[PDB]
Structure 1
Amino acid sequence: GVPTYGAIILDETLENVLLVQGYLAKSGWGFPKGKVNKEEAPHDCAAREVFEETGFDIKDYICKDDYIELRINDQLARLYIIPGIPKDTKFNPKTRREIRNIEWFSIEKLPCHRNDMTPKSKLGLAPNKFFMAIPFIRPLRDWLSRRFG
């Protein structure tokens, strides 16, 4: 899979994270990210995708060792952690044909797993609009505990 890069943007209180909502297959909420171009450095891809999806430029804020990286179905996704962005920042996508909306979410209210369907004795997981964000939530909470406490 082609690797993806993007960001976890947090506000000044460290309570809230910025998610984006796409269209079609990408209808759920997720962290801003996208696929790396040929010869593009990870930091440059993260900044480009985030600026395309949110209109906010992270380039001056990225720290090289501060990221969460997950390999899901043999595709690597790396999100740089960007704290301290004011909640009153005006975010606006460049790609308004791919982004429906952009919102802050309380980290403590976000799920870190989807719910099963054990009440219905049925296998699998119930739909959840945060499906794509979910795998990052526990690692993020653990990362914020180690870094800040």
Structure 2
Amino acid sequence: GVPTYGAIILDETLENVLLVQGYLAKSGWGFPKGKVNKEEAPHDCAAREVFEETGFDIKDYICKDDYIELRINDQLARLYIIPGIPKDTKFNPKTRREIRNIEWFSIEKLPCHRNDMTPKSKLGLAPNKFFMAIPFIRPLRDWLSRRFG
């Protein structure tokens, strides 16, 4: 699978994170990210995908060692951590053809797992609109505790 790169953008309080909402298969909320092009460096892919999806340029804010990386079904996803972005920043995707909406969410209110269906004696997980974000939430919380306190 082709690696994806993007960002976890936080506000000044460190309470809130910026998620984007796509369409169709990407219909829920997730961190802005996308597939690396041929010969493109990771930091440049992250800036491009984030700029294409939010209209915000992270290039001057990326720190090389500050990211969360996960391997999900043998595809690697790396999100650079970008704190301190004012909550009154105007975000606008390049085209509403890929991005429905862009919103701040409270980190403490986001789920860090989906719910089973043990109530119904049925296997699997209930749908959750944050399914794309969820795998990064606990590692983010842990990373913020270590790097800030």
Q: Please report the TM-score for the alignment, with normalisation by the length of structure 1.
A: 1.00
Structure 2 distance, partners of 1:70, 1:96, is: 28
SS state of the match for residue 34, structure 1?
strand
Structure 1 distance, partners of 2:64, 2:97, is: 31
**1:123 equivalent in structure 2:** 123
Structure 1 distance, partners of 2:42, 2:140, is: 19
SS state of the match for residue 45, structure 2?
helix
Residues 5-33 of structure 1: per-residue CA shift (max 9 Å, x gap)? 00000000000000000001000100000
Could you list the runs of 5+ residues in structure 2 that have no partner in the other structure? none
SS state of the match for residue 58, structure 1?
coil
Structure 2 distance, partners of 1:95, 1:20, is: 13
Q: How many residues align?
A: 149
Structure 1 distance, partners of 2:95, 2:106, is: 25
Measure how far apart 1:122 and its partner are.
0.1
Measure how far apart 1:95 and its partner are.
2.8
Residues 51-81 of structure 1: per-residue CA shift (max 9 Å, x gap)? 0000000000000000000000000000000
SS state of the match for residue 99, structure 1?
coil
Q: Percent identity, aligned pairs only?
A: 100
Structure 1 distance, partners of 2:24, 2:93, is: 17
Structure 1 distance, partners of 2:4, 2:129, is: 20
Report the RMSD for the aligned CA atoms in angstroms. Answer: 0.3
SS state of the match for residue 100, structure 2?
strand
Could you list the runs of 5+ residues in structure 1 that have no partner in the other structure? none
Measure how far apart 1:96 and its partner are.
1.6
Measure how far apart 1:144 and its partner are.
0.1
Structure 2 distance, partners of 1:138, 1:64, is: 21
How do residues 74-89 of structure 1 correspond to structure 2 at under 5 angstroms? Answer: 74-89=74-89
**2:101 equivalent in structure 1:** 101
Structure 1 distance, partners of 2:40, 2:96, is: 24
SS state of the match for residue 142, structure 1?
helix
**1:31 equivalent in structure 2:** 31
Moved >4 Å (runs of 4+): none
